[PDB]
Write a protein that holds these residues in place. Structure first.
Motif, PDB file in Angstrom:
ATOM      1  N   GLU A   1      -5.632  -0.569  -1.867  1.00 57.82           N
ATOM      2  CA  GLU A   1      -5.743  -1.164  -3.193  1.00 57.82           C
ATOM      3  C   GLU A   1      -4.509  -0.877  -4.039  1.00 57.82           C
ATOM      4  OE1 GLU A   1      -8.172  -3.616  -4.482  1.00 57.82           O
ATOM      5  OE2 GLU A   1      -7.567  -3.509  -2.359  1.00 57.82           O
TER       6      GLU A   1
ATOM      7  N   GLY B   1      -1.682   2.719  11.161  1.00 64.11           N
ATOM      8  CA  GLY B   1      -1.593   2.461   9.729  1.00 64.11           C
ATOM      9  C   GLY B   1      -2.120   1.127   9.238  1.00 64.11           C
TER      10      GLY B   1
ATOM     11  N   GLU C   1      -9.018   5.323   2.586  1.00 65.39           N
ATOM     12  CA  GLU C   1      -7.900   4.425   2.863  1.00 65.39           C
ATOM     13  C   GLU C   1      -7.846   3.256   1.888  1.00 65.39           C
ATOM     14  OE1 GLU C   1      -8.414   3.368   7.029  1.00 65.39           O
ATOM     15  OE2 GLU C   1      -6.729   4.798   7.342  1.00 65.39           O
TER      16      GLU C   1
ATOM     17  N   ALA D   1      -2.405  -3.197   4.921  1.00 67.44           N
ATOM     18  CA  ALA D   1      -3.563  -3.988   4.515  1.00 67.44           C
ATOM     19  C   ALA D   1      -3.466  -4.520   3.096  1.00 67.44           C
ATOM     20  CB  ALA D   1      -4.837  -3.157   4.650  1.00 67.44           C
ATOM     21  N   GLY D   2      -2.512  -4.053   2.298  1.00 68.30           N
ATOM     22  CA  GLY D   2      -2.452  -4.453   0.905  1.00 68.30           C
ATOM     23  C   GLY D   2      -1.291  -5.335   0.483  1.00 68.30           C
ATOM     24  N   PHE D   3      -0.334  -5.655   1.409  1.00 65.53           N
ATOM     25  CA  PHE D   3       0.747  -6.629   1.234  1.00 65.53           C
ATOM     26  C   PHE D   3       0.419  -7.866   2.051  1.00 65.53           C
ATOM     27  CE2 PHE D   3       4.544  -4.876  -0.944  1.00 65.53           C
ATOM     28  CZ  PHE D   3       4.196  -3.537  -1.031  1.00 65.53           C
ATOM     29  N   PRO D   4       0.663  -9.072   1.547  1.00 69.92           N
ATOM     30  CA  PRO D   4       0.360 -10.261   2.348  1.00 69.92           C
ATOM     31  C   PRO D   4       1.141 -10.252   3.654  1.00 69.92           C
ATOM     32  CG  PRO D   4       0.766 -10.832   0.050  1.00 69.92           C
ATOM     33  CD  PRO D   4       1.240  -9.428   0.242  1.00 69.92           C
TER      34      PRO D   4
ATOM     35  N   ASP E   1       3.072 -12.491   5.073  1.00 71.83           N
ATOM     36  CA  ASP E   1       4.498 -12.866   5.171  1.00 71.83           C
ATOM     37  C   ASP E   1       5.445 -11.741   4.688  1.00 71.83           C
ATOM     38  OD1 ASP E   1       4.036 -15.397   2.499  1.00 71.83           O
ATOM     39  OD2 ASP E   1       3.906 -13.214   2.361  1.00 71.83           O
TER      40      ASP E   1
ATOM     41  N   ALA F   1       2.567  -4.887  -4.824  1.00 71.68           N
ATOM     42  CA  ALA F   1       2.964  -6.228  -4.418  1.00 71.68           C
ATOM     43  C   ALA F   1       2.991  -7.172  -5.612  1.00 71.68           C
ATOM     44  CB  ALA F   1       2.031  -6.759  -3.334  1.00 71.68           C
ATOM     45  N   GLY F   2       2.050  -7.018  -6.543  1.00 74.92           N
ATOM     46  CA  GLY F   2       2.078  -7.871  -7.716  1.00 74.92           C
ATOM     47  C   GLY F   2       3.396  -7.769  -8.460  1.00 74.92           C
TER      48      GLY F   2
ATOM     49  N   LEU G   1       6.440  -6.659  -7.340  1.00 75.58           N
ATOM     50  CA  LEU G   1       7.606  -7.078  -6.572  1.00 75.58           C
ATOM     51  C   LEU G   1       7.632  -8.577  -6.290  1.00 75.58           C
ATOM     52  CD1 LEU G   1       7.522  -4.084  -4.017  1.00 75.58           C
ATOM     53  CD2 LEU G   1       8.656  -4.247  -6.222  1.00 75.58           C
ATOM     54  N   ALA G   2       6.496  -9.267  -6.377  1.00 78.26           N
ATOM     55  CA  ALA G   2       6.477 -10.732  -6.241  1.00 78.26           C
ATOM     56  C   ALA G   2       7.194 -11.373  -7.413  1.00 78.26           C
ATOM     57  CB  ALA G   2       5.050 -11.255  -6.162  1.00 78.26           C
TER      58      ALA G   2
ATOM     59  N   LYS H   1      -4.734  -0.066   8.119  1.00 79.75           N
ATOM     60  CA  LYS H   1      -5.657  -0.159   6.992  1.00 79.75           C
ATOM     61  C   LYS H   1      -5.100   0.447   5.712  1.00 79.75           C
ATOM     62  CE  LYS H   1      -9.819  -1.426   9.112  1.00 79.75           C
ATOM     63  NZ  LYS H   1      -9.066  -1.944  10.314  1.00 79.75           N
TER      64      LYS H   1
ATOM     65  N   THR I   1      -1.495  -3.251  -3.111  1.00 84.13           N
ATOM     66  CA  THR I   1      -1.600  -4.591  -3.670  1.00 84.13           C
ATOM     67  C   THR I   1      -1.074  -4.611  -5.101  1.00 84.13           C
ATOM     68  OG1 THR I   1      -3.408  -5.300  -2.206  1.00 84.13           O
ATOM     69  CG2 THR I   1      -3.200  -6.415  -4.322  1.00 84.13           C
ATOM     70  N   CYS I   2      -1.300  -3.535  -5.865  1.00 89.09           N
ATOM     71  CA  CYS I   2      -0.752  -3.476  -7.220  1.00 89.09           C
ATOM     72  C   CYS I   2       0.756  -3.577  -7.193  1.00 89.09           C
ATOM     73  CB  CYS I   2      -1.182  -2.193  -7.909  1.00 89.09           C
ATOM     74  SG  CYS I   2      -2.955  -2.141  -8.046  1.00 89.09           S
TER      75      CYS I   2
END
Lengths: 265, 265, 265, 265
Positions: B255, B191, B250, B197-200, B202, B261-262, B264-265, B193, B258-259
């Motif tokens: 992609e 998994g 993938e 692959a889309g969460f930093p 840490d 993650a924006g 939840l940050a 990729k 990452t959205c």
């Protein structure tokens, strides 16, 4: 909707945060306190190396500079190590960007010459680049600890983002000198927990940090989408309210960068 | 608005996207095609393991199972190597989570007993977590090949997220059995990729992928913020226009993560 | 005299260790069980990419090779994700080295053509290089599980060190093709706890690893002194007495690797 | 044998090398020119701090010490910035371990009181630990420039090594103050290119460097093998003959630390 996340974070961290990401084509320009002045701190060393590169033939990097123990008035992880051998202008550039070497900065300022130890000469450069706002007044270490509200030694996220865009993405430097500036930022050792930490690992990140008193923590960077688009990311913060002795909070800058990244995806 | 993004990613990638992040105490739930059926593909292998665990004692895991070379019908990088020695149930567990071993899943199904080689017993198990939507009708590798429109071998991002959240975060298993799942899901090999692959970096990530025809790609994963806050992220996609041989993209799932993650940050 | 530390290392890992380092200009060779056969395991993948590179123009790296889910008879971290799209020879090369992809190696042997599914052609390439001891008989995954005492699929630390030296440090390949094999080895993912772990980080380390049953665990590498002298280091081990299921001990290789560094400095 | 390796490294780097690792239960001690005097240089700042620690209570770390611009005579990148704020003892402790702060050294000596600005006080404390040989006589930066052959301000590898072992490993400090020492030592900025650069990265390293004239470079360190076992490594070197301003060679210290790692592995 993104100016609310940033605002929630300002209160989360008892900090003030500024963000600017210049607009590319297919995307719009992110801003947040984008024109509020923040203190340069060591982020000025990136265009400082750009300035020295600009004004000289590449053969000038091999010029050896020599200094005394009294020139070491600030954290200098490299200059402290060659007080008697001295170092060439080229290493001072390496040190000033890759290690945020305060002393190397101060010598490179001197190479620029002029009044105010080269600070005025430096503020000249930014102006040439179109930057009508920033200003450098002191050397290291004073430029980190001006009082809150003092316009000395300040820039904006808007203005610093665009000086950076021209230097690495634009034509302010000829390609041979530009690659030197770039590779240095890319091999930086001081921003692992800032914009670097807020972006996925398959995004390339070159950056230059800045830290000072009053909880000041900055990170200016250029990031590359995994498909190869570049975006310029200026993040800046202070906690002046909590006093000269306020710790900076790097997480705020990494967390910001994650809000921004999810927007660029 | 985050839903305009998911419809962007759909256009840019020529796909249908499905996203569901269970609402936590500190955040609202994300939804995009949340209650639309997507194909299970290999993501059923995660609830499959927790089923054998739930019905059986830990000692069951040492039941060596044997098989012929005719039982190997889908991608089975591990089953293929032991076809003469056999594999214990607890291996078939490792096999099926970390390598998506198609064949080992088919055995693990058979181990759950019942009519259609265990698919009835398995959907059966899902309903004990409160999931009345999802169903498993086929075995490997037919379940990957159902035509669009068809409701067999389908779940939804809403359905799968909540099942997952019970099994990793909730009391759907006792701690001893619960850590065998989370460990395999943490050292998964298929998994890298997708959601990951889309969460930093840490952020901690554990996922089970699924892939099949008509561009089907999925990743179900449990993530952990750098400060330990767990979330649950279900991402599913298919490109049922581009044909049965449509390739899975993938980058789309990466992609999309990452959205999230924006937010939840 | 370095034979004493090694034999001490054999005793507390319950393993047998082979070590060879060809003699450079100024320094003498290091050997210990340097001519006892050890199983190739996956270390053969690096000279296999050499052999394919050798017999085809660079443009041959664009050939699209197509395989099926039956071809996946062994751990294949990359080949398992492109069953539908197919993969090019340069993609297979990258997987075969950087991820030790098993299926990737099999197709590459098939690209070599000839009897034995290509094992013949590979073994002949080694003869051309000067190697008269090694031999590739089986494909993957069989080659990892010949029983102890069996010359099949075995090389010697001596012989593998002199093959790797010619490929990386000599003219057995032309510059354009050679710089491709090195980069793939320099960018390996499987080797972090072996010879890489036994050498100070200021040394450059490119490697290919091997692992099979009977606790077999090898690592073959070229290293660079931080002043740039190159050294070849073949390290091979097994625990074949412990049986088929014996675990390999990676730290044996790191530690053997530290013994050797102390001597190259 | 190893004795011959250190005289090799001596010939190549043009120095006289000093090397001592106390014997542990498992190892036999390493000695090379081990009881020959080399110059403390900055490495005394390690026992200097533990001296303040031993004699005063914890509250003493909050005593602010003010100083003048005239009191700055050494490399003092931290003392240079607080000439108005002053510095607490805890701060002057940090400065002196992690940045080798010349001017914080003197202040801490003056905290030890007595004659010679606390040089008499200091050796005093040394002797209370068994060390009958080392003497401190001058201050920063006179102590760094004593001529060769002069016994003032000198220690020996065997000498300094056992005091360091008492301090980090032994019971010369109660654990509460024992931790502040080791912590400052672990986060040291001045020694990346010395002993640290010669041990693999799965070895933990703490150290206090020293540098001066006639090519003097030292590093005293406590290292931790990856399994958990601790050693003490004392590495010193000068190049009297090649001159007073003879440049020191960190490479030598890193080379020798790689041979030590060879024996202990």
């Amino acid at each position: 909707d993104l100016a609310d996340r940033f605002a929630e974070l300002e209160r989360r961290y008892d900090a003030r945060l500024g963000v600017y990401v210049p607009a590319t084509g297919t995307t719009a320009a992110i801003e947040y306190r984008a024109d509020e002045r923040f203190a340069f701190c060591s982020t000025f060393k990136a265009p400082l190396v750009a300035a020295v590169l600009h004004q000289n033939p590449l053969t000038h990097l091999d010029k050896l500079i020599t200094y005394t123990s009294d020139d070491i008035r600030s954290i200098s992880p490299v200059a402290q190590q060659h007080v008697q051998t001295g170092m060439t202008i080229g290493q001072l550039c390496d040190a000033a960007i890759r290690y945020s070497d305060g002393t190397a900065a101060n010598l490179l300022l001197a190479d620029l010459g002029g009044p105010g130890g080269g600070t005025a000469a430096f503020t000249g450069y930014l102006r040439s680049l179109g930057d009508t706002v920033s200003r450098l007044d002191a050397e290291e270490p004073e430029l980190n600890r001006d009082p809150p509200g003092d316009e000395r030694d300040t820039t904006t996220p808007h203005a610093i983002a665009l000086v950076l865009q021209q230097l690495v993405l634009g034509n302010a430097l000829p390609p041979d000198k530009r690659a030197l500036l770039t590779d240095w930022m890319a091999r930086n050792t001081t921003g692992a927990k800032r914009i670097r930490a807020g972006f996925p690992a398959d995004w390339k990140v070159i950056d230059k940090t800045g830290t000072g008193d009053y909880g000041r923590a900055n990170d200016i960077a250029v990031v590359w989408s995994p498909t190869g688009v570049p975006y310029v990311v200026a993040v800046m913060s202070d906690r002046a309210g909590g006093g000269y002795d306020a710790e900076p909070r790097e997480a705020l800058l990494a967390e910001a960068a994650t809000c921004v990244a999810g927007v660029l995806a």
